[PDB]
Tab-separated table of N, CA, C and O in Angstrom:
chain	number	residue	atom	x	y	z
P	1	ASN	N	-4.965	14.645	13.120
P	1	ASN	CA	-5.047	13.491	12.227
P	1	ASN	C	-4.406	13.735	10.859
P	1	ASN	O	-3.798	12.834	10.286
P	2	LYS	N	-4.516	14.953	10.336
P	2	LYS	CA	-4.125	15.162	8.950
P	2	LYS	C	-2.630	15.279	8.760
P	2	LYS	O	-2.142	14.981	7.667
P	3	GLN	N	-1.922	15.719	9.796
P	3	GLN	CA	-0.474	15.881	9.736
P	3	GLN	C	0.223	14.544	9.523
P	3	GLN	O	1.125	14.429	8.691
P	4	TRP	N	-0.222	13.481	10.207
P	4	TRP	CA	0.361	12.138	10.063
P	4	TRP	C	-0.154	11.472	8.855
P	4	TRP	O	0.482	10.692	8.251
P	5	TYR	N	-1.341	11.802	8.374
P	5	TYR	CA	-1.823	11.225	7.136
P	5	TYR	C	-0.974	11.734	5.994
P	5	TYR	O	-0.671	11.034	5.066
P	6	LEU	N	-0.637	13.000	6.056
P	6	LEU	CA	0.180	13.542	4.978
P	6	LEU	C	1.514	12.811	4.952
P	6	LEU	O	1.948	12.325	3.907
P	7	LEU	N	2.162	12.737	6.110
P	7	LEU	CA	3.442	12.044	6.227
P	7	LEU	C	3.359	10.621	5.688
P	7	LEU	O	4.279	10.145	5.010
P	8	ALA	N	2.268	9.918	5.996
P	8	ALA	CA	2.121	8.548	5.515
P	8	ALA	C	1.997	8.506	3.994
P	8	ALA	O	2.572	7.621	3.346
P	9	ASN	N	1.265	9.458	3.399
P	9	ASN	CA	1.140	9.461	1.942
P	9	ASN	C	2.489	9.720	1.279
P	9	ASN	O	2.840	9.065	0.290
P	10	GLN	N	3.251	10.685	1.796
P	10	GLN	CA	4.602	10.897	1.285
P	10	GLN	C	5.433	9.632	1.423
P	10	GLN	O	6.143	9.231	0.492
P	11	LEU	N	5.331	8.975	2.576
P	11	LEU	CA	6.227	7.874	2.855
P	11	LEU	C	5.884	6.660	2.006
P	11	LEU	O	6.782	6.011	1.466
P	12	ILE	N	4.597	6.369	1.821
P	12	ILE	CA	4.241	5.289	0.908
P	12	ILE	C	4.733	5.611	-0.495
P	12	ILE	O	5.155	4.720	-1.239
P	13	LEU	N	4.701	6.889	-0.874
P	13	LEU	CA	5.239	7.281	-2.169
P	13	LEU	C	6.748	7.093	-2.216
P	13	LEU	O	7.284	6.628	-3.227
P	14	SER	N	7.450	7.459	-1.138
P	14	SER	CA	8.895	7.239	-1.087
P	14	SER	C	9.228	5.765	-1.240
P	14	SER	O	10.208	5.414	-1.907
P	15	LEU	N	8.418	4.889	-0.636
P	15	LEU	CA	8.657	3.454	-0.760
P	15	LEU	C	8.442	2.984	-2.193
P	15	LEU	O	9.257	2.224	-2.729
P	16	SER	N	7.356	3.431	-2.829
P	16	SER	CA	7.077	3.029	-4.205
P	16	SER	C	8.237	3.367	-5.134
P	16	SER	O	8.558	2.595	-6.042
P	17	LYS	N	8.875	4.516	-4.929
P	17	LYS	CA	9.952	4.940	-5.814
P	17	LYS	C	11.328	4.449	-5.375
P	17	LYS	O	12.280	4.564	-6.150
P	18	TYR	N	11.458	3.885	-4.176
P	18	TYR	CA	12.763	3.426	-3.720
P	18	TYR	C	13.240	2.233	-4.546
P	18	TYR	O	12.445	1.512	-5.159
P	19	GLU	N	14.559	2.042	-4.572
P	19	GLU	CA	15.150	0.921	-5.292
P	19	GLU	C	14.479	-0.396	-4.921
P	19	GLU	O	14.362	-0.744	-3.740
P	20	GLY	N	14.027	-1.124	-5.943
P	20	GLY	CA	13.355	-2.389	-5.737
P	20	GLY	C	11.927	-2.295	-5.260
P	20	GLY	O	11.259	-3.332	-5.155
P	21	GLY	N	11.424	-1.092	-4.982
P	21	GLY	CA	10.107	-0.968	-4.380
P	21	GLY	C	8.986	-1.532	-5.231
P	21	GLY	O	7.993	-2.038	-4.695
P	22	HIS	N	9.125	-1.460	-6.560
P	22	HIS	CA	8.110	-1.983	-7.471
P	22	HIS	C	7.722	-3.416	-7.148
P	22	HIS	O	6.622	-3.849	-7.508
P	23	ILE	N	8.609	-4.161	-6.484
P	23	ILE	CA	8.336	-5.547	-6.120
P	23	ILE	C	7.165	-5.641	-5.141
P	23	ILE	O	6.405	-6.619	-5.157
P	24	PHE	N	6.965	-4.616	-4.319
P	24	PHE	CA	5.938	-4.640	-3.287
P	24	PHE	C	4.749	-3.761	-3.629
P	24	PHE	O	3.840	-3.614	-2.801
P	25	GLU	N	4.717	-3.206	-4.841
P	25	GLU	CA	3.698	-2.217	-5.191
P	25	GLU	C	2.318	-2.851	-5.315
P	25	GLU	O	1.339	-2.333	-4.769
P	26	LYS	N	2.216	-3.955	-6.051
P	26	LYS	CA	0.967	-4.666	-6.272
P	26	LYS	C	1.006	-5.998	-5.538
P	26	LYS	O	2.076	-6.520	-5.208
P	27	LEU	N	-0.176	-6.558	-5.296
P	27	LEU	CA	-0.249	-7.910	-4.764
P	27	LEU	C	0.272	-8.913	-5.791
P	27	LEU	O	0.075	-8.760	-7.000
P	28	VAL	N	0.966	-9.941	-5.293
P	28	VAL	CA	1.434	-11.029	-6.146
P	28	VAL	C	0.268	-11.661	-6.888
P	28	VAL	O	-0.755	-12.018	-6.293
P	29	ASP	N	0.417	-11.794	-8.202
P	29	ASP	CA	-0.461	-12.641	-9.004
P	29	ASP	C	0.170	-14.027	-9.003
P	29	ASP	O	1.130	-14.280	-9.733
P	30	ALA	N	-0.371	-14.924	-8.172
P	30	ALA	CA	0.327	-16.165	-7.835
P	30	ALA	C	0.665	-16.981	-9.079
P	30	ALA	O	1.781	-17.499	-9.211
P	31	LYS	N	-0.286	-17.109	-10.005
P	31	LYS	CA	-0.009	-17.852	-11.230
P	31	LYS	C	0.936	-17.078	-12.144
P	31	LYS	O	1.869	-17.657	-12.713
P	32	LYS	N	0.729	-15.762	-12.268
P	32	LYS	CA	1.452	-14.970	-13.262
P	32	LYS	C	2.930	-14.809	-12.919
P	32	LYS	O	3.764	-14.715	-13.825
P	33	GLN	N	3.277	-14.759	-11.632
P	33	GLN	CA	4.666	-14.635	-11.206
P	33	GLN	C	5.304	-15.983	-10.887
P	33	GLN	O	6.409	-16.018	-10.332
P	34	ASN	N	4.635	-17.089	-11.235
P	34	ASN	CA	5.105	-18.445	-10.935
P	34	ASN	C	5.342	-18.622	-9.436
P	34	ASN	O	6.352	-19.178	-8.998
P	35	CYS	N	4.384	-18.137	-8.643
P	35	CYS	CA	4.402	-18.249	-7.185
P	35	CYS	C	3.144	-18.979	-6.718
P	35	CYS	O	2.353	-18.430	-5.943
P	36	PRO	N	2.929	-20.222	-7.166
P	36	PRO	CA	1.609	-20.847	-6.965
P	36	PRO	C	1.289	-21.159	-5.511
P	36	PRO	O	0.113	-21.365	-5.187
P	37	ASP	N	2.287	-21.201	-4.631
P	37	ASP	CA	2.083	-21.477	-3.216
P	37	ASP	C	1.972	-20.208	-2.377
P	37	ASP	O	1.891	-20.300	-1.147
P	38	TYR	N	1.973	-19.033	-3.013
P	38	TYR	CA	2.182	-17.787	-2.279
P	38	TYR	C	1.065	-17.537	-1.272
P	38	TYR	O	1.321	-17.177	-0.118
P	39	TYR	N	-0.179	-17.715	-1.687
P	39	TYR	CA	-1.278	-17.432	-0.778
P	39	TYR	C	-1.609	-18.603	0.130
P	39	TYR	O	-2.441	-18.449	1.031
P	40	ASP	N	-0.982	-19.764	-0.079
P	40	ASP	CA	-0.997	-20.792	0.954
P	40	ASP	C	-0.035	-20.445	2.078
P	40	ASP	O	-0.196	-20.947	3.197
P	41	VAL	N	0.949	-19.597	1.795
P	41	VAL	CA	1.887	-19.090	2.787
P	41	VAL	C	1.445	-17.750	3.360
P	41	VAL	O	1.489	-17.540	4.572
P	42	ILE	N	1.083	-16.807	2.500
P	42	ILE	CA	0.784	-15.446	2.924
P	42	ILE	C	-0.725	-15.346	3.117
P	42	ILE	O	-1.488	-15.319	2.149
P	43	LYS	N	-1.158	-15.325	4.373
P	43	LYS	CA	-2.579	-15.288	4.687
P	43	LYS	C	-3.092	-13.881	4.963
P	43	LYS	O	-4.306	-13.703	5.088
P	44	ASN	N	-2.197	-12.897	5.043
P	44	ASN	CA	-2.531	-11.484	5.245
P	44	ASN	C	-1.779	-10.684	4.195
P	44	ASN	O	-0.797	-9.995	4.498
P	45	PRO	N	-2.204	-10.766	2.939
P	45	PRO	CA	-1.462	-10.095	1.864
P	45	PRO	C	-1.533	-8.579	1.983
P	45	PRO	O	-2.533	-8.008	2.426
P	46	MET	N	-0.447	-7.924	1.572
P	46	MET	CA	-0.380	-6.475	1.633
P	46	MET	C	0.603	-5.984	0.583
P	46	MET	O	1.568	-6.676	0.239
P	47	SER	N	0.316	-4.803	0.046
P	47	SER	CA	1.158	-4.157	-0.956
P	47	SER	C	1.054	-2.654	-0.760
P	47	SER	O	0.154	-2.164	-0.070
P	48	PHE	N	1.993	-1.921	-1.368
P	48	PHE	CA	1.943	-0.467	-1.291
P	48	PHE	C	0.618	0.051	-1.819
P	48	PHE	O	0.064	1.021	-1.291
P	49	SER	N	0.094	-0.578	-2.870
P	49	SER	CA	-1.130	-0.071	-3.475
P	49	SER	C	-2.330	-0.282	-2.557
P	49	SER	O	-3.226	0.573	-2.503
P	50	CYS	N	-2.369	-1.406	-1.826
P	50	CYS	CA	-3.411	-1.586	-0.816
P	50	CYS	C	-3.344	-0.476	0.223
P	50	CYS	O	-4.372	0.088	0.614
P	51	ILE	N	-2.133	-0.134	0.659
P	51	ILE	CA	-1.971	0.887	1.683
P	51	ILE	C	-2.393	2.251	1.147
P	51	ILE	O	-3.042	3.035	1.853
P	52	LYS	N	-2.066	2.544	-0.119
P	52	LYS	CA	-2.506	3.799	-0.723
P	52	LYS	C	-4.029	3.890	-0.754
P	52	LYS	O	-4.603	4.959	-0.499
P	53	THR	N	-4.699	2.776	-1.061
P	53	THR	CA	-6.158	2.744	-1.015
P	53	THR	C	-6.665	3.036	0.390
P	53	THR	O	-7.584	3.838	0.576
P	54	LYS	N	-6.074	2.392	1.394
P	54	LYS	CA	-6.484	2.662	2.765
P	54	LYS	C	-6.316	4.136	3.109
P	54	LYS	O	-7.176	4.729	3.774
P	55	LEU	N	-5.208	4.745	2.673
P	55	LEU	CA	-5.033	6.173	2.902
P	55	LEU	C	-6.063	6.964	2.115
P	55	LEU	O	-6.681	7.892	2.646
P	56	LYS	N	-6.261	6.601	0.847
P	56	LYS	CA	-7.253	7.276	0.014
P	56	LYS	C	-8.635	7.244	0.661
P	56	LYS	O	-9.373	8.237	0.628
P	57	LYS	N	-9.000	6.113	1.260
P	57	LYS	CA	-10.320	5.918	1.839
P	57	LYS	C	-10.403	6.343	3.304
P	57	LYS	O	-11.434	6.116	3.940
P	58	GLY	N	-9.346	6.938	3.853
P	58	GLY	CA	-9.364	7.340	5.250
P	58	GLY	C	-9.584	6.199	6.220
P	58	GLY	O	-10.213	6.393	7.268
P	59	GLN	N	-9.073	5.011	5.908
P	59	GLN	CA	-9.324	3.843	6.737
P	59	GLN	C	-8.349	3.689	7.890
P	59	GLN	O	-8.554	2.808	8.725
P	60	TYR	N	-7.306	4.512	7.979
P	60	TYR	CA	-6.436	4.473	9.145
P	60	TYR	C	-6.952	5.439	10.204
P	60	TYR	O	-7.216	6.609	9.913
P	61	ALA	N	-7.099	4.943	11.431
P	61	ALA	CA	-7.542	5.779	12.538
P	61	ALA	C	-6.408	6.194	13.459
P	61	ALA	O	-6.548	7.190	14.178
P	62	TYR	N	-5.303	5.452	13.468
P	62	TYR	CA	-4.169	5.767	14.313
P	62	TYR	C	-2.906	5.633	13.476
P	62	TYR	O	-2.853	4.800	12.565
P	63	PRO	N	-1.888	6.456	13.749
P	63	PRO	CA	-0.673	6.407	12.916
P	63	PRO	C	0.028	5.061	12.948
P	63	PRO	O	0.659	4.682	11.953
P	64	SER	N	-0.062	4.330	14.067
P	64	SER	CA	0.579	3.023	14.158
P	64	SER	C	0.002	2.037	13.149
P	64	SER	O	0.694	1.100	12.734
P	65	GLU	N	-1.268	2.211	12.768
P	65	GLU	CA	-1.896	1.261	11.853
P	65	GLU	C	-1.247	1.309	10.479
P	65	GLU	O	-1.071	0.267	9.832
P	66	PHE	N	-0.888	2.507	10.013
P	66	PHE	CA	-0.158	2.609	8.753
P	66	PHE	C	1.178	1.885	8.848
P	66	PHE	O	1.560	1.141	7.933
P	67	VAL	N	1.895	2.073	9.957
P	67	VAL	CA	3.192	1.419	10.100
P	67	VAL	C	3.013	-0.092	10.137
P	67	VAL	O	3.781	-0.839	9.515
P	68	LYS	N	1.970	-0.560	10.836
P	68	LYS	CA	1.702	-1.993	10.946
P	68	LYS	C	1.492	-2.626	9.579
P	68	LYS	O	2.019	-3.713	9.305
P	69	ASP	N	0.738	-1.957	8.698
P	69	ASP	CA	0.530	-2.497	7.355
P	69	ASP	C	1.824	-2.491	6.533
P	69	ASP	O	2.088	-3.436	5.779
P	70	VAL	N	2.627	-1.431	6.627
P	70	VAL	CA	3.894	-1.455	5.888
P	70	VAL	C	4.773	-2.582	6.412
P	70	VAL	O	5.380	-3.337	5.638
P	71	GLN	N	4.855	-2.719	7.739
P	71	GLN	CA	5.702	-3.762	8.303
P	71	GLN	C	5.222	-5.142	7.885
P	71	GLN	O	6.034	-6.063	7.736
P	72	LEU	N	3.910	-5.300	7.690
P	72	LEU	CA	3.373	-6.568	7.212
P	72	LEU	C	3.919	-6.906	5.833
P	72	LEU	O	4.218	-8.070	5.548
P	73	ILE	N	4.074	-5.903	4.966
P	73	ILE	CA	4.701	-6.149	3.674
P	73	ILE	C	6.072	-6.771	3.871
P	73	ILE	O	6.422	-7.764	3.223
P	74	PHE	N	6.863	-6.217	4.793
P	74	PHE	CA	8.228	-6.715	4.951
P	74	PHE	C	8.243	-8.065	5.647
P	74	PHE	O	9.100	-8.908	5.357
P	75	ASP	N	7.326	-8.270	6.591
P	75	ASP	CA	7.227	-9.561	7.261
P	75	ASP	C	6.764	-10.653	6.307
P	75	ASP	O	7.288	-11.771	6.343
P	76	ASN	N	5.774	-10.367	5.456
P	76	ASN	CA	5.405	-11.353	4.441
P	76	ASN	C	6.580	-11.640	3.515
P	76	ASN	O	6.794	-12.784	3.105
P	77	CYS	N	7.335	-10.607	3.157
P	77	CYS	CA	8.483	-10.802	2.277
P	77	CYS	C	9.491	-11.764	2.900
P	77	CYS	O	9.901	-12.754	2.274
P	78	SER	N	9.901	-11.498	4.143
P	78	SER	CA	10.892	-12.368	4.762
P	78	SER	C	10.329	-13.754	5.032
P	78	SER	O	11.072	-14.744	4.983
P	79	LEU	N	9.027	-13.863	5.307
P	79	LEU	CA	8.455	-15.189	5.517
P	79	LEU	C	8.469	-16.006	4.232
P	79	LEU	O	8.895	-17.168	4.225
P	80	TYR	N	7.993	-15.425	3.130
P	80	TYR	CA	7.878	-16.206	1.902
P	80	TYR	C	9.244	-16.474	1.271
P	80	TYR	O	9.500	-17.581	0.785
P	81	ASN	N	10.138	-15.499	1.289
P	81	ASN	CA	11.377	-15.583	0.519
P	81	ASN	C	12.551	-15.988	1.398
P	81	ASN	O	12.717	-15.471	2.510
P	82	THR	N	13.365	-16.913	0.895
P	82	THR	CA	14.546	-17.334	1.632
P	82	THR	C	15.476	-16.146	1.817
P	82	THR	O	15.531	-15.240	0.985
P	83	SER	N	16.207	-16.152	2.929
P	83	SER	CA	16.958	-14.968	3.325
P	83	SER	C	18.079	-14.619	2.356
P	83	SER	O	18.520	-13.465	2.336
P	84	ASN	N	18.563	-15.568	1.555
P	84	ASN	CA	19.626	-15.257	0.608
P	84	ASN	C	19.090	-14.932	-0.781
P	84	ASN	O	19.880	-14.792	-1.724
P	85	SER	N	17.772	-14.793	-0.921
P	85	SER	CA	17.179	-14.482	-2.210
P	85	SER	C	17.221	-12.975	-2.485
P	85	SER	O	17.260	-12.149	-1.568
P	86	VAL	N	17.209	-12.630	-3.778
P	86	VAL	CA	17.186	-11.224	-4.179
P	86	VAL	C	15.991	-10.512	-3.564
P	86	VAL	O	16.103	-9.381	-3.057
P	87	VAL	N	14.827	-11.161	-3.584
P	87	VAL	CA	13.634	-10.513	-3.062
P	87	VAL	C	13.768	-10.273	-1.561
P	87	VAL	O	13.446	-9.187	-1.064
P	88	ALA	N	14.277	-11.258	-0.815
P	88	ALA	CA	14.377	-11.057	0.630
P	88	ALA	C	15.373	-9.954	0.962
P	88	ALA	O	15.132	-9.148	1.866
P	89	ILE	N	16.495	-9.909	0.241
P	89	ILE	CA	17.489	-8.856	0.448
P	89	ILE	C	16.889	-7.490	0.141
P	89	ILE	O	17.047	-6.534	0.911
P	90	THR	N	16.220	-7.376	-1.009
P	90	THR	CA	15.521	-6.145	-1.365
P	90	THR	C	14.534	-5.707	-0.287
P	90	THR	O	14.431	-4.512	0.025
P	91	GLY	N	13.777	-6.655	0.274
P	91	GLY	CA	12.796	-6.309	1.289
P	91	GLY	C	13.432	-5.814	2.575
P	91	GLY	O	12.950	-4.853	3.186
P	92	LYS	N	14.528	-6.452	2.998
P	92	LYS	CA	15.286	-5.948	4.140
P	92	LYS	C	15.779	-4.530	3.898
P	92	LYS	O	15.740	-3.693	4.808
P	93	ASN	N	16.291	-4.256	2.695
P	93	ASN	CA	16.832	-2.929	2.400
P	93	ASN	C	15.751	-1.863	2.449
P	93	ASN	O	15.981	-0.751	2.943
P	94	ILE	N	14.573	-2.168	1.896
P	94	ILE	CA	13.473	-1.213	1.918
P	94	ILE	C	12.955	-1.049	3.333
P	94	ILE	O	12.586	0.053	3.752
P	95	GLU	N	12.933	-2.142	4.099
P	95	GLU	CA	12.527	-2.061	5.495
P	95	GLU	C	13.425	-1.106	6.276
P	95	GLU	O	12.944	-0.301	7.080
P	96	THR	N	14.737	-1.191	6.072
P	96	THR	CA	15.630	-0.248	6.738
P	96	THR	C	15.344	1.181	6.296
P	96	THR	O	15.290	2.099	7.125
P	97	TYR	N	15.161	1.386	4.989
P	97	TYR	CA	14.820	2.710	4.478
P	97	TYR	C	13.563	3.249	5.151
P	97	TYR	O	13.521	4.411	5.576
P	98	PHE	N	12.522	2.416	5.244
P	98	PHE	CA	11.261	2.849	5.838
P	98	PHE	C	11.456	3.236	7.295
P	98	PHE	O	11.104	4.348	7.705
P	99	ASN	N	12.033	2.331	8.093
P	99	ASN	CA	12.251	2.621	9.507
P	99	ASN	C	13.086	3.880	9.702
P	99	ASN	O	12.878	4.625	10.667
P	100	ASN	N	14.047	4.133	8.812
P	100	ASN	CA	14.822	5.356	8.942
P	100	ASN	C	14.027	6.567	8.494
P	100	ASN	O	14.191	7.649	9.060
P	101	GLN	N	13.135	6.401	7.515
P	101	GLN	CA	12.268	7.510	7.140
P	101	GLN	C	11.312	7.858	8.275
P	101	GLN	O	10.999	9.034	8.487
P	102	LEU	N	10.850	6.850	9.024
P	102	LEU	CA	10.008	7.121	10.191
P	102	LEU	C	10.721	8.045	11.166
P	102	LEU	O	10.096	8.916	11.791
P	103	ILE	N	12.038	7.879	11.290
P	103	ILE	CA	12.836	8.740	12.153
P	103	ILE	C	12.977	10.132	11.543
P	103	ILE	O	12.605	11.144	12.160
P	104	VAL	N	13.522	10.207	10.321
P	104	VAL	CA	13.834	11.507	9.723
P	104	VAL	C	12.586	12.376	9.623
P	104	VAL	O	12.617	13.563	9.955
P	105	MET	N	11.477	11.806	9.147
P	105	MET	CA	10.234	12.563	9.023
P	105	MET	C	9.564	12.856	10.356
P	105	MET	O	8.634	13.668	10.390
P	106	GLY	N	9.999	12.235	11.445
P	106	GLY	CA	9.344	12.480	12.712
P	106	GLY	C	8.019	11.776	12.860
P	106	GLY	O	7.209	12.174	13.704
P	107	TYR	N	7.761	10.753	12.039
P	107	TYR	CA	6.508	10.009	12.134
P	107	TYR	C	6.379	9.306	13.476
P	107	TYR	O	5.268	9.176	14.009
P	108	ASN	N	7.498	8.842	14.031
P	108	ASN	CA	7.453	8.135	15.305
P	108	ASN	C	6.939	9.034	16.423
P	108	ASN	O	6.383	8.534	17.409
P	109	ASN	N	7.103	10.355	16.282
P	109	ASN	CA	6.543	11.284	17.260
P	109	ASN	C	5.027	11.177	17.312
P	109	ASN	O	4.433	11.263	18.390
P	110	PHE	N	4.378	11.012	16.156
P	110	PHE	CA	2.929	10.835	16.154
P	110	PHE	C	2.535	9.541	16.851
P	110	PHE	O	1.511	9.491	17.544
P	111	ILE	N	3.328	8.481	16.674
P	111	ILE	CA	2.992	7.212	17.311
P	111	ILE	C	3.142	7.316	18.822
P	111	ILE	O	2.320	6.791	19.579
P	112	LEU	N	4.178	8.009	19.290
P	112	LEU	CA	4.351	8.178	20.728
P	112	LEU	C	3.276	9.086	21.314
P	112	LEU	O	2.868	8.907	22.469
P	113	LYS	N	2.806	10.059	20.536
P	113	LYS	CA	1.712	10.902	20.994
P	113	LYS	C	0.423	10.094	21.105
P	113	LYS	O	-0.291	10.180	22.110
P	114	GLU	N	0.113	9.307	20.073
P	114	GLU	CA	-0.898	8.253	20.110
P	114	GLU	C	-0.921	7.509	21.445
P	114	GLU	O	-1.960	7.457	22.110
P	115	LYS	N	0.222	6.953	21.856
P	115	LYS	CA	0.260	6.123	23.056
P	115	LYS	C	-0.083	6.924	24.307
P	115	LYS	O	-0.953	6.524	25.090
P	116	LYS	N	0.589	8.061	24.523
P	116	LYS	CA	0.321	8.830	25.737
P	116	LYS	C	-1.129	9.285	25.806
P	116	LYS	O	-1.718	9.324	26.892
P	117	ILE	N	-1.717	9.642	24.664
P	117	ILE	CA	-3.137	9.996	24.636
P	117	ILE	C	-4.001	8.809	25.027
P	117	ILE	O	-4.893	8.921	25.875
P	118	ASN	N	-3.764	7.662	24.396
P	118	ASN	CA	-4.509	6.463	24.749
P	118	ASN	C	-4.356	6.155	26.230
P	118	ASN	O	-5.333	5.818	26.910
P	119	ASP	N	-3.144	6.327	26.757
P	119	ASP	CA	-2.897	6.045	28.162
P	119	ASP	C	-3.606	7.028	29.080
P	119	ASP	O	-3.961	6.666	30.198
P	120	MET	N	-3.823	8.271	28.674
P	120	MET	CA	-4.459	9.132	29.659
P	120	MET	C	-5.970	8.904	29.692
P	120	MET	O	-6.588	9.010	30.754
P	121	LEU	N	-6.584	8.704	28.522
P	121	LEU	CA	-7.968	8.257	28.441
P	121	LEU	C	-8.246	7.170	29.465
P	121	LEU	O	-9.202	7.256	30.241
P	122	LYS	N	-7.408	6.127	29.453
P	122	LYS	CA	-7.510	5.050	30.432
P	122	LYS	C	-7.550	5.598	31.853
P	122	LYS	O	-8.318	5.118	32.696
P	123	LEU	N	-6.751	6.620	32.131
P	123	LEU	CA	-6.712	7.232	33.455
P	123	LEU	C	-7.699	8.376	33.590
P	123	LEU	O	-7.382	9.418	34.163
P	124	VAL	N	-8.903	8.204	33.054
P	124	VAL	CA	-10.002	9.134	33.284
P	124	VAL	C	-11.265	8.328	33.555
P	124	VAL	O	-11.477	7.282	32.941
């Protein structure tokens, strides 16, 4: 469990410091950012800081869950923001960075190990 938790903490940190990442660090303050419709659109809000809290609190039980929450950030981004907007472009770029970091760091190996383990349990 701890090997993938470490990787996730590094990776959330890599996202926070990546170009444009500050946009996804905190939850949108709908009034303060002039986004008054944001939570009428985004019903599952997520930010890097929420994910850091989940890691801090040991709330992830499987490595895929961390990836699912990060991907939710990017999915909310593309849903709320038009595809030709600066924010949507930034979110696509960070999404590519993240998915490639999953490869370079070998995080996807933990997810595939997750699956085969879950699958053998079923076959017992």
